């Protein structure tokens, strides 16, 4: 629920895992979204998202190509 270095949504969605920027964990792409992008993509706070059951977090990310 802790925002890390920001990267554009397109970089996170269209880049192969091994080609992602230093420090970007492919399994935690949402933490690299800007606050604006996070709100636009998920429509909830990061804390709210992190408190969702894992299956829901994954399903939401899958629908957005962020899993």
UniProtKB/Swiss-Prot annotation:
Residues 1-67 form the HP domain. Phosphorylated on tyrosine residues. The unphosphorylated form increases the initial rate of actin-nucleating activity, whereas the tyrosine-phosphorylated form inhibits actin-nucleating activity, enhances actin-bundling activity and enhances actin-severing activity by reducing high Ca(2+) requirements. The tyrosine-phosphorylated form does not regulate actin-capping activity. Residues 61-64 are annotated as: Absolutely required for activity. Changing residue 28 to A: Reduces affinity for F-actin. It is found in: Cytoplasm, Cytoskeleton; Cell projection, Microvillus; Cell projection, Lamellipodium; Cell projection, Ruffle. Residues 1-67 are annotated as: Headpiece. Changing residue 55 to A: Loss of F-actin binding. Specifically expressed in epithelial cells. Component of brush border microvilli. Signal peptide: none annotated. Belongs to the villin/gelsolin family. Monomer. Homodimer. Associates with F-actin; the association with F-actin is inhibited by tropomyosin. Epithelial cell-specific Ca(2+)-regulated actin-modifying protein that modulates the reorganization of microvillar actin filaments. Plays a role in the actin nucleation, actin filament bundle assembly, actin filament capping and severing. Binds phosphatidylinositol 4,5-bisphosphate (PIP2) and lysophosphatidic acid (LPA); binds LPA with higher affinity than PIP2. Binding to LPA increases its phosphorylation by SRC and inhibits all actin-modifying activities. Binding to PIP2 inhibits actin-capping and -severing activities but enhances actin-bundling activity. Consists of a large core fragment in the N-terminal portion and a small headpiece (HP) in the C-terminal portion. The core fragment is necessary for both actin-nucleating and -severing activities, whereas the HP binds F-actin strongly in both the presence and absence of calcium and is necessary in actin-bundling activity. The Gelsolin-like 1 repeat is necessary for the actin-capping activity. The entire core fragment is necessary for the actin-severing activity. This is Villin-1. It comes from Gallus gallus (Chicken). The gene is VIL1. The chain holds residues 760 to 826 of 826 of the full protein.
């Amino acid at each position: 629920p802790t925002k890390l270095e920001t990267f554009p949504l397109d970089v996170l969605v269209n880049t192969a895992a091994e080609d992602l920027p230093r420090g970007v964990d492919p399994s935690r792409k949402e933490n690299h979204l800007s606050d604006e992008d996070f709100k636009a993509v998920f429509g909830m706070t990061r804390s709210a998202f992190a408190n969702l059951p894992l299956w829901k977090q994954q399903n939401l990310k899958k629908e957005k190509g962020l899993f």
